[PDB]
Amino acid sequence: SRVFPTQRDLMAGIVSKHIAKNMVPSFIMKAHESGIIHVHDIDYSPALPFTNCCLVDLKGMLENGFKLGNAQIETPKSIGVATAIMAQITAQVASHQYGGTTFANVDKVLSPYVKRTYAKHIEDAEKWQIADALNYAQSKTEKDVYDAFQAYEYEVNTLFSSNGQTPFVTITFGTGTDWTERMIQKAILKNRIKGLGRDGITPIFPKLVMFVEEGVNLYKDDPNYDIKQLALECASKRMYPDIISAKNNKAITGSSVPVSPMGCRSFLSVWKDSTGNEILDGRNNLGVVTLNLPRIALDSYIGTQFNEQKFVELFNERMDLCFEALMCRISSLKGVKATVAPILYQEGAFGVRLKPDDDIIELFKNGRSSVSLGYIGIHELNILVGRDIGREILTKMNAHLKQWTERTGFAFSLYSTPAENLCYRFCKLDTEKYGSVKDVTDKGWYTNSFHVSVEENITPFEKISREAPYHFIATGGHISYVELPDMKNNLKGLEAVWDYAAQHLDYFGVNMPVDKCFTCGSTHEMTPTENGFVCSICGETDPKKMNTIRRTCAYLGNPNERG
Amino acid sequence: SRVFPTQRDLMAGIVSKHIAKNMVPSFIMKAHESGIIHVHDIDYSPALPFTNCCLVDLKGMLENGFKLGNAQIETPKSIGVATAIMAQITAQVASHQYGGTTFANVDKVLSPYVKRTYAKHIEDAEKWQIADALNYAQSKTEKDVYDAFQAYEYEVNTLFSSNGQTPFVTITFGTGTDWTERMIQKAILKNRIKGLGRDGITPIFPKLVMFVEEGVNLYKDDPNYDIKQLALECASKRMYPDIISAKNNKAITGSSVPVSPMGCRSFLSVWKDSTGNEILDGRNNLGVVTLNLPRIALDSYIGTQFNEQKFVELFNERMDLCFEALMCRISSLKGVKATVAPILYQEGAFGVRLKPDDDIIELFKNGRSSVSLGYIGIHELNILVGRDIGREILTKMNAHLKQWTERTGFAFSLYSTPAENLCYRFCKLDTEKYGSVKDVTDKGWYTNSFHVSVEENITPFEKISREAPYHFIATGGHISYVELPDMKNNLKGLEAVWDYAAQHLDYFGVNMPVDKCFTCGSTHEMTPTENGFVCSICGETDPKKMNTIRRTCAYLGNPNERG
Ligand SMILES: Nc1ncnc2c1ncn2[C@H]1C[C@H](O)[C@@H](COP(=O)(O)OP(=O)(O)OP(=O)(O)O)O1
Ligand SMILES: Nc1ncnc2c1ncn2[C@H]1C[C@H](O)[C@@H](COP(=O)(O)OP(=O)(O)OP(=O)(O)O)O1
Ligand SMILES: [Fe+2]
Ligand SMILES: [Fe+2]
Ligand SMILES: [Mg+2]
Ligand SMILES: [Mg+2]
């Protein structure tokens, strides 16, 4: 935060909010200022025409050529070089949009390049007359690939985005059986288990999402079932990888192939080009405006009594407000040329190649890009109205969303905002007006989207069952977590929730304690002190002598830096 | 320029100049505003405590460990990984200072890591029972190293600094004979000749400076004389590498080892630590304030007549002004903690490891860091005063500089400002007051530092001879160029100027036409049109179908983007 690149970003942030204050209609800013809604990234958009997140079309760029910076890159002739260009792209893309960036199916996209490192090695055992032909190659290739993903793993943690930060990047895999594809998968997983750096700590990025599917990943007999096992190990030691149910995913998205989340959890919906092809990679999201659901209910109290009709009034009113807010920023996009971000619009990233002087707004119309109507705190809302209305209000929302899509041509969808930050702001702005409302603003924060309350006491299986239906309503983005104790040696139980989840819902992640004592090397849950974590079996307390990760909200982090 | 990262940098720039307007004493800003002096980087410093340029202590970082971003890196066990960490460091450092960044003697620093790629390969020909032991290794290692520097070459052109730009980076080599050291040298050189990207164009960065020295690089019998030959080829095809006379360099700097330039041409002077060791790597420069020499003379005209005494008055007056300006920004550095730029002050970069809460100002005191008093236009000055006073005014300047050093403890030195940009601004600000003064402001720009006028008509040998003495007066930074026609096949003549130069001066570069037609593949000087370059032997004119580089001022660039 005192670091230079950050100071600089901050400057551009202050200037941006200032310009926003002037571009955004007074009534929308007012609502944002007071917590009715929340216009995300007001420190980037609409001051400059940034977009949000995306699925980089890596196959397109690496396949054909592309210019990156000053280099007109050619197709990689080796695996290591591809995961380099990828780490470089990760950085450039992170610097031309204010949202997460995702490389979907690296196992399948990067496969060709393993097949080249192999070719190269076979032609080498054959040049130097080596005993084992097919055996040299295997080995060398297995290594080249581990190193290649160890490079990526590190480069994502050493390369900075223009705002002076590590790229928020997501890598997905799992639907590949070819030997090269399987090789990348174990490559990614072994590296993560290994840990980042000298002390093999749990990296916070890149996120790892593995698709699990019947006949590939989840049954004792399926081909990559061994991979599932390494995956369970990995997750029990570093949280990631999260898993996505290929079955429910396809069903919910409408795509014939599993849809990877752009960033944390923004899902695209199936879309086709002029020639009728389902396009996934290269597509993106235009932004997010989150609706403070609790605040709708609170604002519609008469005295200390909830008034149902008042709710129906403000709801419809705030629904329109949100549409006006989203449409505001989308319009700011008119006139903007491709000159604004070459790797996105001119070279491969967004899946097309626009001329410099082309408008960028057309590339997003008619459903290619998605737009987010975010919500939060279904729990506190229920408490305020007196009954679970979650499944249904979210549904009254898709209804509006559908009308919007039809009137504007933009593909709007229900997004369950991660709100690592918003969970506090809204509560705080609401507390400012309503004081400490029991069970609502009292705890200090709101529960994520449709998640069960933490303070509730259910069974992992019961929790996923209570949430699963939402994975089908809030299609724009969604995820479910369940808390388990150390599972390092109980992978069967861990695999039991994964299995149950992969059946009933879509995007799933299980977060359990992942700690490491540097002095004593204890992979056991440190016990919390009124002053941090303490090593049970070595008494270690100095924070610098340990790595303590916990996914308290959306990302992982050391909970000893917050209070 | 419409590109996002740049828009953002711009915002932070406007905010920074604004804050400077408030921090910098009115009289200094006034002088800057009017062209008497020129406070460089007012868009970074003093708004934030940035520093200028430096020699990264890569040996220190790679040797011991170091944290970069989130990764606690360990010593490279392979050559490719070292030139990766280097490309990553290049980026991080470029993002914590507003000046060039240099990696001195990559041949010697990176040597160990070639010796490891070799070890690894020998142990492999020995594991797979390969025919040629020492021969497999050689080959594999020779390749690993070419690839390693081809990665660096590219990564410097694809990685961005926080301001949305390719790092201004300099790589030096040449004083190494070990086989590994020689290997890096040819590695660097072959890659450059190869060209950047699909169309093998002349990269603009990283700059290449090779030290040439008797008994190593420049005589038919010396060991790396073959390298000199590849070097001459390289330079004739891509401008770089520039050369530095190890003999005169040591002499001028006082260092026992050739001193590499921080950035374009900022030379350090020999300095020692508490234990009496000459330290080079890790040292840096605090900044630059350039004095408009011509403007001193013009301002000291009485009517249309130059008045000598008036000159002596303003000169002494402006000399003090410059000192007050430099001291201004240096003071802004008091209080600043190491938390401001970890890779520089906490991890290896600046050669020491400060605690977070340590002040950074102490690290620069008592001569470790240099400070720049820049000057420009010795030619126009001569014309205004009526006689060459260059060698001597620069000398009256070192005198002041020496007093400053003694009063402040900071190591001030005469810097011959590159002024790729300033060469026009000063002239323009002066023209604003004196109209079009014959031979001075009339041409539109001022001649760099002590360089002979372009419009003059001398012999390469005569030009270097007229400049050489300045390489010994303006010790803070200096360089000489000479213009030659295509030399692609005349390396002996090219080597003749290099040889003559390496004898009489210090930092040398020869710029000749380096063009390439993409449609016809003609490495011949395109002939200039009132509308760009035209291919002689293929008539090609479309700019996109060619790469036309020319070092018109300090950097190389396509002269078809300016007018
Ligand atoms: N491509 C990379 N970019 C940045 N840091 C890297 C990269 N690859 C590895 N590192 C980090 C991790 C460790 O601190 C150290 C490892 O170097 P190195 O041992 O060469 O890696 P490696 O695992 O590919 O090789 P090996 O298996 O030979 O040890 O550098
Ligand atoms: N480390 C790197 N980072 C970014 N781009 C790179 C890197 N290495 C090479 N490139 C670019 C240059 C070309 O457009 C293309 C070359 O890929 P590749 O052919 O694998 O390089 P190479 O020269 O190391 O291998 P080879 O000798 O096998 O061709 O990618
Ligand atoms: Fe411990
Ligand atoms: Fe041509
Ligand atoms: Mg190649
Ligand atoms: Mg290693």
From Swiss-Prot, chains A, B:
Entry binding sites for Zn(2+): C517, C520, C535, C538
Binding, dTTP: E74, Q88, K120
Binding-site list for dCTP 2: E74, K77, Q88, K120
Its EC number(s): 1.1.98.6
Residues the entry annotates as binding dCTP 1: H38, H40, A419, E420, N421, L422
UniProt modified residues of type Glycine radical: A554
Residue intervals of the Glycine radical domain: 456-563
Pfam families registered for this protein in UniProt: NRDD (PF13597)
One Gene Ontology MF term: ribonucleoside-diphosphate reductase activity, thioredoxin disulfide as acceptor
Source superkingdom: Viruses
Reactions catalysed, as given in the entry: a ribonucleoside 5'-triphosphate + formate + H(+) = a 2'-deoxyribonucleoside 5'-triphosphate + CO2 + H2O
Binding residues annotated for dGTP 2, in chain numbering: E74, K77, K120
Annotated SUPFAM superfamilies: PFL-like glycyl radical enzymes
Binding sites annotated in the UniProt record for dATP: E74, K77, Q88, K120
Binding site for dGTP 1: H38, H40, D41, N421, L422
Example of a GO biological process term: DNA replication
Activity regulation remarks: Activated under anaerobic conditions by NrdG, a tightly associated activase.
PROSITE patterns (UniProt xref): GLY_RADICAL_1, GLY_RADICAL_2
Keyword annotations from UniProtKB, A to Z: Metal-binding, Organic radical, Oxidoreductase, Zinc
CDD domains hit by this protein: RNR_III
InterPro entries listed in its UniProt record: Form_AcTrfase_GR_CS, Gly_radical, NrdD
The keyword Iron-sulfur appears for this protein: no
Function, in words: Catalyzes the conversion of ribonucleotides into deoxyribonucleotides, which are required for DNA synthesis and repair.
Subunit structure: Homodimer. Forms a tetramer composed of two NrdD and two NrdG subunits.
Family to which this protein belongs: Belongs to the anaerobic ribonucleoside-triphosphate reductase family.
Name of protein: Anaerobic ribonucleoside-triphosphate reductase
